[PDB]
Write a protein that binds this ligand. Sequence first.
Ligand SMILES: CC(=O)NCc1ncc[nH]1
Lengths: 156, 39
Amino acid sequence: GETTDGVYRVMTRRLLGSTQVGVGVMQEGVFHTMWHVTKGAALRSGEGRLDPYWGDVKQDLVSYCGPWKLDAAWDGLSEVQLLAVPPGERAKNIQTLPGIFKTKDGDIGAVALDYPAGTSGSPILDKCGRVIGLYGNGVVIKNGSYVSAITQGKRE
Amino acid sequence: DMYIERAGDITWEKDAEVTGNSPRLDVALDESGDFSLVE
Ligand SMILES: CC(=O)NCc1ncc[nH]1
């Protein structure tokens, strides 16, 4: 099917009509998304099939056709952009200064933006357009607002 | 049966809409990939 680099919606026809369950990134011939979007199932791209190649439930990430290719990291100082792809709506860029998730294993950038569940896997970018992680795995804080980690994988 | 459909190029947009705060939170990550708040 289509192998051009860019952002893609992940759809299913299992439910009513065609439903957007998430989003992902095609880069260097590999499709990258969050594990909770596909649960590691195979995907279709036109008449072609994309098979899982690497996945990890704890990281909440999965790659198809080859190993995880995204390795840029948030600089810890600058604003980034969420390239949100909401269900039934055009791709839109939202600029924000990340906050931080402090964990026992180190600090991770986090974005305080709330989009529909089907926006999970949308990329977060730096000023050079590099993908520094995927949006959609996070927490709900006291105010009731959603805060997503900037989740990034390891390039072997 | 899941399928993918292209939605756009990955680029930074000059003068994009700017919003969101920057919370500093103590969090925990469990074996199932769920984040939770540590209080
Ligand atoms: C707990 C959690 O990560 N919620 C899923 C989500 N909601 C909107 C985008 N992603």
